[PDB]
Design a protein around this ligand. Structure first.
Ligand SMILES: *C(=O)c1cc(/C=C(\NC(C)=O)C(=O)N[C@H]2CCCCN(Cc3ccc(-c4ccccc4)cc3)C2=O)ccc1CC(=O)O
Length: 106
C-alpha cells in the first residue's frame, strides 16, 4: 500500500511540496509522491534539484496509473507498482532532474 509508503505524502498541494523541498539541507533527488491537484487518479513525483544556474529548485513529474495496472512517468517504461517505479528511479536518473535519493523531511 502506497499509503503505507513513507514517501507517499498523499493529499498535499504543489506549493506545500515546494515549501518542504526548498530547504537548503535537501540534497539533489530529495523527493515525495503526492496526489495530482488536477488529474484524478494521477500522481506527482516532486523532486528537489540543485545546479549553479537555477540554485535549489523543484521539478514535478506526472505519474500515470492505468486501469490495466501499470504505473509510469513515460509509457515506454512501466512498473507493476508505484514502489517499483520509485526503486527504479532511485537507481536511474533517465529523464529526471536527478535520481531519487531520500524522502523529503516533513
Ligand atoms: C503531477 O502530476 C503534476 C506534474 C506537472 C509537471 C509539470 N508542470 C509544471 C508546471 O511543473 C512539468 O512540466 N514537469 C516537467 C519536469 C521537468 C522535465 C520536463 N518535463 C517533460 C518531461 C517529463 C519527464 C520526462 C521523463 C521522466 C523520467 C524518465 C524519462 C522521461 C521527460 C520529459 C516535465 O513534464 C504538472 C502538474 C501536476 C499536477 C499538480 O502539480 O498537482
Amino acid at each position: 500500500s502506497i499509503q503505507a509508503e513513507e514517501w507517499y505524502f498523499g493529499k498535499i498541494t504543489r506549493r506545500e511540496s515546494e515549501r518542504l523541498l526548498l530547504n537548503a539541507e535537501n540534497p539533489r533527488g530529495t523527493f515525495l509522491v503526492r496526489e495530482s491537484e488536477t488529474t484524478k487518479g494521477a500522481y506527482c513525483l516532486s523532486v528537489s534539484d540543485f545546479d549553479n544556474a537555477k540554485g535549489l529548485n523543484v521539478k514535478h513529474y506526472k505519474i500515470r496509473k492505468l486501469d490495466s495496472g501499470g504505473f509510469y512517468i513515460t509509457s515506454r517504461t512501466q512498473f507493476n507498482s508505484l514502489q517499483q517505479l520509485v526503486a527504479y528511479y532511485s537507481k536511474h536518473a533517465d529523464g529526471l532532474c536527478h535520481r531519487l535519493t531520500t524522502v523529503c523531511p516533513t
